[PDB]
Design a protein around this ligand. Structure first.
Ligand SMILES: Nc1nc2c(c(=O)[nH]1)N[C@@H](CNc1ccc(C(=O)N[C@@H](CCC(=O)O)C(=O)O)cc1)CN2
Ligand SMILES: Nc1nc2c(c(=O)[nH]1)N[C@@H](CNc1ccc(C(=O)N[C@@H](CCC(=O)O)C(=O)O)cc1)CN2
Lengths: 272, 272
């Protein structure tokens, strides 16, 4: 370490776009139209996503059915794993049941009853699992307070036999315009997490959160991603359709010496 | 700390452009034409530089006279301090003698006879001083080996009564295409330096080195600057004419919480 990364694993890009918070996805789900879902699956895959996040959004429909449908629909057209994005454990498990390959669970909080439910499920289905550094008492402001919750996630994951390489800790980034002070604490938390065990737990962020409902988001997203990667970030749920963002990531990845430099590294990175 | 900065000092931009390695500067110096020097002084000032680097470049002329002339010529049209960029101590001192305000000396190596000459000169003229993490044995590859030389710089500066706030340690960045492995070690060195004393020594880089004689430099420069700033960088000799670079810096500066967020932060940053 500290800033010299222990490993050289490719940065993991999790395409954010198949998420019922978006109208087109919400309506495709309403009309059970698989076309918009498959279009976004293909697009994200073509941009180099390693996982596709899958989030039902708000719905009065049975989320179990919706999640199932999304997963099957996506995996019908691309050979990519899903990052199953829900607080509903039955929605998650339904997705895991029809999922081809190793999925990612998104996510468990540091709440004990959440951990007790989600960890055995990741173990059972051999899925990676995201653990958010938060509980019912809320999201901690301080890096140190986030880190405690991180420690608690590590302990529980390990207690379920889940390897650290399968555990992705999310310190929860918040919009810089209304929660500016969090952004730097998150960086420091990422650094701390990378110290917690050997091998270390991985780290992940909902990157776009940092600019949500801010003006001129693309600059802010790509700046923060570079900062986070520097701090040790292993993965991000992010807009893989943003070419400038992915260029930024590929450049940081080279500058961290995790992939051998060549003149065509911007392309190389997207294939990896 | 660690990544949460102790302070909130504005990032220090040192305009790189008045440097005899550039033909127009070299020729302005040859013809003793003050116009190109003053033009670049004004331009850089308008882009928000806090210092202007001043480097004679290669010349068969008396560097003492050249440096004097450059400093007077620059300060004739802008109210900015100079970052006097030479290995010739008499060139440096000549510049310090005619310099208006507090200059920066660029630089001393960790060579003992260099330190013994340059440190008393900074003290005497009340100039900030850059110390490069290198000596006659060469530039160390490892962060740890760079850090030792950093430690030696701190010790000597302190032994001359120079405050840490006046000492800028340069771990020497090298082009990523031929010395890729250095870039991450430099980051780790910056982090380490920020730990060496209280208050900590400052840090600085010749940023453009990272892409020198590489294709598509602007992306690489701005990515690395963001990484370096994240690691703790306080200043950089850089191309302040590169708007994308300065946007990148301003965004990182906000994300580090060193300046209160507002929607117009890209402008705000350039005035500060
Ligand atoms: N583990 C984890 N999972 C997450 C998040 C996280 O943090 N951590 N955060 C979220 C990450 N995904 C997104 C997806 C889109 C946006 C986004 O920004 N949406 C547009 C929608 C615009 C439109 O509707 O057209 C907006 O402006 O609000 C933000 C985060 C959801 N999942
Ligand atoms: N303390 C310190 N001082 C420094 C450096 C450093 O590290 N540390 N490194 C240098 C930083 N300044 C520059 C200025 C320009 C360029 C640059 O890249 N020049 C163009 C010139 C093109 C042209 O001639 O038109 C090029 O392509 O080579 C690189 C570093 C000099 N001073």
């Amino acid at each position: 370490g500290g800033l010299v990364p222990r490993g050289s694993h490719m940065f993991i890009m999790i395409g954010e776009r198949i998420n019922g918070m978006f109208k087109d996805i919400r309506e495709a789900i309403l009309n059970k139209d698989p076309r918009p879902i498959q279009e976004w699956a293909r697009r994200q895959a073509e941009k180099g996503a390693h996982y596709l996040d899958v989030n039902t959004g708000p719905t009065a429909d049975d989320p179990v059915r919706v999640m199932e449908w999304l997963v099957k629909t996506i995996q019908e057209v691309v050979d990519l794993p899903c990052c199953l994005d829900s607080t509903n454990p039955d929605a998650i498990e339904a997705g895991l049941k029809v999922h081809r390959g190793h999925a990612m669970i998104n996510s468990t909080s540091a709440d004990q009853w959440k951990m007790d439910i989600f960890f055995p499920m990741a173990k059972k289905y051999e899925a990676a699992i995201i653990g958010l550094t938060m509980n019912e008492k809320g999201v901690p402001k301080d890096a140190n307070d986030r880190s405690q919750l991180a420690m608690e996630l590590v302990a529980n994951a390990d207690a379920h036999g889940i390897p650290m390489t399968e555990l992705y800790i999310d310190p929860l980034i918040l919009p810089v315009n209304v929660a500016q002070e969090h952004a730097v604490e998150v960086l420091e938390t990422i650094r701390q997490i990378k110290l917690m065990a050997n091998p270390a737990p991985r780290t992940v962020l909902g990157l776009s959160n940092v600019s949500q409902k801010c003006p001129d988001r693309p600059l802010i997203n790509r700046t923060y991603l570079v900062m986070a990667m520097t701090a040790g970030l292993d993965a991000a749920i992010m807009d893989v359709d943003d070419d400038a963002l992915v260029d930024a990531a590929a450049t940081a990845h080279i500058l961290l010496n995790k992939e051998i430099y060549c003149d065509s590294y911007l392309k190389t990175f997207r294939q990896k």
